[PDB]
Symmetry: D2
Subunit: 374 residues, 4 copies
C-alpha cells in the first residue's frame, strides 16, 4: 500500500518549562537532574530513528505540510485563545491551562502539529495515498475549544476534520481514540453531532481523573454517536481485542464511515508511567489491522492515524513501528524484545473473564448487535 508519513523535525523541538514527569517543578517537586517534562520529544524521536534504521521510512511516502492557518484554527478555537497562546509563547513560555505547560515558540510548533493532521486527512481524501500516519507533536485529543489541557494546545483532529469538511465535503468520519486516556476534547466538540462518531477506549478514571463515561453516549442529534469504553486498570491484550470486537467494529458497521481517523496514543503499553494497562506492540498491530480492514470495507481504505500520547521512551517506538508496518503492509526485521515478557504478565483467566462480561454488558447497554464485518 501507499502509506504517507507526515513528519516534521521541528515538532521534535517543542519543550515546556521544568517538570518532574507530569508535575510542574517547584514547591516540593525537585527539578529532574536528567529527564525533564513528560511530553518529551524523545519518544517520538526514537520512533522516527527506529523507522529509519528498520528501513521502513524508505518504503513510506515521506511528507511535511504547511502549518495550520488561523482560518483552520478558528473553526474550533476563538481568536482570544490564539492571541493568549501567542503572547505566552512570545513571552518565553508558561502555563496555558490544566496540565498544559508551554515553552518559547510553542505556538509555532503547535500550529505545525495541527497542520500535519490537516494535511494527512487531505492527502488521504484526495487519493494521494491509501492511508497516512501523522507524527503530530504536541498532541490534541484533550484540548477543548477555549481550554488547553493534558499537554494538548490545539484540538488537532477536530481542526483537521473541520478543514476536511470545508475542502472535501466529507459527511461521515469515525474517530477511534485508543490513547489510554479519555479523548475528552474530541468528545466535547462532536458531542451533539452525528457526522462524527467518536469512540474512546481508555483506562477507567485515568485522565481526566475519575471519569469513566460509559453513560455519556452523545446528546440529541449526536445520541449514539459518542462511545466510551472504560477498561479496568490492569487490562491488556484480551481486554482491547474484546473491546474492538464487541463495541468498536459493530459501531463502525452501523455508522458506515467515509474516513476513519485513529487518535493513536501508545500509553496503553505495559511499561507506560501514565497508565496501568498491559498492551504490547502486537496489540497495536492487531488494532490497526482491524481498523484498516474496516476502512477498506467502508471508506475505500481511507485511514489516517494521528500520534497522540506515549511516554515510555524504551517501548513506544516498537508500538509505533508495529502500527506503521500494518498500515504499509511492510514487515521489518525488528523484533519486539518485550513481547514475550508482556505475554506472561497478562491478566489471569478470572480477571479476563470479569472484563469480558463487563464488555458484553456494555455492548448490550449501547444497543450494539454482535454481527460480523461485511
Amino acid at each position: 500500500r501507499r502509506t504517507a508519513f507526515f513528519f516534521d523535525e521541528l515538532c521534535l523541538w517543542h519543550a515546556a518549562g521544568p517538570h518532574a514527569l507530569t508535575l510542574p517543578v517547584g514547591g516540593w517537586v525537585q527539578p529532574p537532574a536528567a529527564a525533564g517534562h513528560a511530553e518529551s520529544p524523545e519518544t517520538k524521536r526514537r520512533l522516527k530513528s527506529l523507522l529509519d534504521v528498520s528501513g521502513l521510512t524508505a518504503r513510506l511516502q515521506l511528507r511535511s505540510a504547511p502549518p495550520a492557518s488561523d482560518e483552520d484554527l478558528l473553526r474550533v478555537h476563538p481568536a482570544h485563545y490564539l492571541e493568549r497562546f501567542k503572547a505566552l509563547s512570545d513571552a518565553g513560555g508558561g502555563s496555558l491551562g490544566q496540565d498544559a505547560p508551554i515553552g518559547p515558540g510553542s505556538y509555532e510548533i503547535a500550529r505545525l502539529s495541527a497542520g500535519l493532521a490537516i494535511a494527512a486527512l487531505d492527502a488521504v481524501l484526495a487519493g494521494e495515498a491509501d492511508n497516512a500516519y501523522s507524527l503530530s507533536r504536541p498532541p490534541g485529543h484533550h484540548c477543548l475549544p477555549d481550554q488547553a489541557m493534558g499537554f494538548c494546545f490545539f484540538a488537532n483532529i477536530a481542526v483537521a476534520i473541520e478543514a476536511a469538511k470545508a475542502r472535501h465535503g466529507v459527511e461521515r468520519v469515525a474517530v477511534l481514540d485508543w490513547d489510554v486516556h479519555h479523548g475528552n476534547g474530541t468528545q466535547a466538540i462532536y458531542y451533539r453531532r452525528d457526522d462524527v462518531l467518536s469512540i474512546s477506549l481508555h483506562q477507567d478514571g485515568c485522565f481526566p481523573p475519575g471519569y469513566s463515561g460509559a453513560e455519556d453516549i452523545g446528546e440529541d442529534r449526536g445520541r449514539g454517536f459518542n462511545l466510551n469504553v472504560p477498561l479496568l486498570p490492569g487490562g491488556g491484550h484480551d481486554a482491547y481485542m474484546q473491546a474492538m470486537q464487541r463495541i468498536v467494529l459493530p459501531a463502525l458497521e452501523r455508522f458506515r464511515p467515509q474516513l476513519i481517523v485513529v487518535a493513536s496514543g501508545f500509553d496503553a503499553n505495559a511499561v507506560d508511567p501514565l497508565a496501568r494497562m498491559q498492551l504490547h506492540s502486537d496489540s497495536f498491530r492487531a488494532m490497526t489491522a482491524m481498523v484498516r480492514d474496516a476502512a477498506e470495507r467502508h471508506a475505500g481504505g481511507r485511514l489516517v492515524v494521528v500520534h497522540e500520547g506515549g511516554f515510555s521512551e524504551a517501548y513506544v517506538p516498537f508500538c509505533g513501528l508495529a502500527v506503521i508496518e500494518e498500515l504499509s503492509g511492510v514487515r521489518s526485521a525488528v523484533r519486539d524484545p518485550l513481547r514475550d515478557f508482556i505475554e506472561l504478565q497478562q491478566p489471569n483467566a478470572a480477571f479476563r473473564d470479569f472484563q469480558r462480561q463487563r464488555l458484553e454488558e456494555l455492548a448490550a447497554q449501547f444497543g450494539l448487535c454482535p454481527a460480523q464485518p461485511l
Copy 2:
C-alpha cells in the same frame, strides 16, 4: 520515636552500562539521550534530597555502616559467586546474571548496600533505635544465593537476618515484602524455615513474569511460613488495605515475630513503569502504620524497613518520605501533589469487590478467615 536512617552517598554511585528502561542497549534498542539504566540512583538520590529539604533528616538518627564482611556475605552466597562478581566488577562491568548488569566498582557498592541492612537490624536489636530505615542500593529481594537477578546482586535482607541471628540469637523474624514484584530470593532462602515468616504482596505475574504463587506456602518445617498474595494488576489502595487486614496482620498475629523487616519497594506506586498498581504515598503511610503496630504488639517495636525497588523519579520520594514520617512519628510540611489525583483513579466499586472476594477466598485457603 527514635528512628535510625542508614545511608551512604557512595550507594548512589553504582551505575550499569547503557540501558533504555530495563532493556540493555544493543540491537534494536537505541541508546537513551538522557535517562540510562532502570535502576538509576536518581530515585534514591531524590528521596534523600526530599528528606533533607523537608527537615525530617534533622529528627532522625543518621547512621552509616561498614561494608558487609565476607563472613556476613558467606552466610548466604558462595565464595565463587563473590569471586565471579568481583572479577566482572574489576573488568569495567558487564552482565552478572539475568536482568543483572553491573558497572565498575559495583562489587564494593553492593557490599556497602548489604552492610547498611546488617547495621540497621543490629541497631534495632541492640536498642540503639526503636526502628530503622536502610537506603540500600542496589536492592536485594530477588537475589538467590548463586544467581543475581532483577538488579539484585546480594540478598541484602537474608544476609542481614543471618548476621542478626549469629549476633543476637533472634528466634522469629517476619519479612513483609511490599515491593510490587515477588520476593523470590527471600522466599527461596527461607522456604523450609519456620524461624522466618516470609510474606510477599505482589502484582500477579509481574516479576518473575507469570508467577502468582498463592499455592507455594513453604515446605516441611517451613510449611505455612511463606505467604504469597498475588494482587490483580490495576489495584491500588483498597486492594493493599484488604491484603494487609485479611492476610498480613492475621499472619503476623499468629507468628508472634520478635523482629519485623519490611522489603519496601515503592514500585506499586501509581506512576511506576515496572508495574501496573495504583498506590499513593498514604497507602505506603498506612502499611507502615499497620506493620509498626504489629511490631509494637509482638516485637517490642523492633521494625526495620529496607528500601528495595521503585523506578518513578518523580513519585518514589513522596512514598519513601511517608514511610519515614510514619516510622519516626513526625509529620513534615511536604504535601504529596499527586495524592488527590491518584485517589480519583482508583478501581471502581465492582473491581474493588472482585478483588476483595479473591482475597477472602485466599485468606480462607491460608486458614486465616
Copy 3:
C-alpha cells in the same frame, strides 16, 4: 582549622526554563535532549557528593542559614526589583534580565543563596569558625542593584557585606573574584568606595563580552580600590600565579583587609565550556593557600569563600574539593585524574613570558610595589 561549610539542599533545586548551554531554547536553538540550562545544579551537587565520599564533609562544621530578609536585600536592591522577581517567580518563571532566566520558586531559592553568603561572613566575623565556604546557588557576582544578568539575581556578596557592616561594623573588606568572568556587579556597587577593595581576575573580554577593564581602577573615594586583571585567553597555572604574586598580594598588603571574601568560580578550569583558561585543581589550591595566608597575616584568619561559576560537571568537583582541603587543612585521598594531563597543555615558554611581561606592566600601571608578605 575550623572551617564552616554553608550549604542547603534546596539551593540545588533552582532551575530555569529550557536552555541549550547558555542559549535560551527557541528560534534556531533546539531543546537539549539530556542536559538543559547552563546554570545547572549538577556541578554543585557533584561537589557536595565528592566532599561526602571523600570524608571531608565529616571534618567541616556543616551549617545552613535562614534566607536573606527583604531588609538585607533592600540594602542593595530596590523594592520594585524584589516585587518583579517575586511576580515572575510566582507566575512559573521567565526572563528577568540579560542572560538571567528563572523558574518557579526561583525567588525563594535566590533568597536562600544570599542568606548563606550573609551567614558565612557573620560566622567568621563572630569567631564561630576560622574560615568558611558557602555553596551559594544561584550565584551573585554579575548582578547589579536593578539588573539581573549572567544567571545572577541578587548581588550575594554585596548583600552579605552590607549586612556584615550593619551587624559587625567591619571597616575594610577585600573581595577577590577568581571566577573566570568579570565581577561586574561587585565592581559597580563598590566602585566609589574605599571600604571594599574589589579585585577581579578574568579572561580578557569573556563576560561581559569585550570588557577588559584594566583602566577601570575605581573613582574618587574608590580610586585605587578596584583592580581588574584581564588575562589573555588560553592562560593557565602560571598566568594566575603571576597575577596573584604581582597584583593581588601587593594590593592586599596595602589595603590591610579585616576580612577577605573570595568570589570563587571554577570556570577557569581547563575543560570549562564558558571560558578558554587552563587551570587545574592545584591552581585553585595554590590560590586558596595564598589568600588564606593573607587572611592569617591581616585579618586574623578571617576568610570566606563563596561559590560562583563553574560549568564542567566532570571537573568542578575536583577544583572545589582542593579549595576546601586548603581552607580546612585536611588532605583527602582524592587524586585529580586530569591534573597531569592539564600540566602538559599549559602555554609554552614564549606565551608564558608574553603574559608575564603584560602582568609586570599592569602592576607598574597600578602603582603596585613588588614587596613580599609581612
Copy 4:
C-alpha cells in the same frame, strides 16, 4: 553546486560505557545523572536536525553507503586489530585503547562510519557530486593502524584515500585537518609519503597532550609533505585566518592537489570543553570558502569534508551548518545566535600581533614566506 551529504541514522546509535565528559566512570568520578560520554551522538544528531529544520537538506544530494569492507579496512588496519575490536564489541563493550571506549555493536557502527568516508570520496572522484560532506561517527583522525585512541577506532580518512587510490588512481591528495586536536593518525600513516600532503591546524599541546610538532615536516620521500601549525591556546578567528593565508593556501598552491579532504572537527569553537580556541560559525564558513577555492583552482572542485570532533551540543550544529552552506553555495535562514558574542571575546590587538608574528616565523621555517 551539487553537494552530497553522506549520513546514516545508525551512526548516531554508537555509545560507550559511563563517562563524565572524557573521564571513565569509576574511582572518584561519579556517574553523570544526565550527560554520559564525551563522544555523545547528540552533537552529530543536532547538526542533522538543524540541517532538516533549516531546509538545507532539501538542497543537498542525500546519500548513504554500505559499511566498509574488510578489504578496505585491511589497507590500513591489521586482521588482528579487527578481530580484537570485534570480540570486545560482541562482549558488550569495554576499552579498546587509550581514551578509546566502545559499546555493544560499536564495531559495525565504526565500519559504517568508515564506509561513509569511502563513499563520499568515491562520489566526488566519479563526478556524482561537485563536493561532499560525510557525517562520520565515530571519528578517525587520531586512529593509528594498530592503536585506537582519542575516540577514533578506524582511520576513516586514510581508509577512504587508500580505497580512492585503488579505485580511481588519484595521485595527489591534500588532507587539511582543522579539528582542534592534532591529526596524529593521518600524520603517521602518510609521514613518508609525497602523494598525500597532510596539514594539521591544532591547539599547541592540547591532544596529544604536550605535542606541538612544527619541526615534524615528514621524512625522506615525505619530507615537506607534513605541516603542523600549533596555534596558541586562546586564539580564534584571526589566528586561523592567518594560518590559512600564510601556511595552508600557499602549501596547497605548491602541492597542486587533485582532491582535497578536510578532517573537519568543530572543537575549535569558542564554547567547546575539549580545547581553548575561540572560533565561530563564520570562521568555519571562511575556512571552507578558502579550501573550496583551492579545490576549484587545482582539483576540479573536488572537495570532501569528513566530520571529526566537536563536543558542544549547543554550538557545533551552527558551525557544521555554515560549512555545508558554503559547500553547496546555499544560505539558509539560520542565524548563529552566538556570533556577535564570540566576535567581542576575540584576542586583543597585542595577542593577535603576537600570534601573527609566530605564524610569520613558522611560514618562513616551512619556506612559504
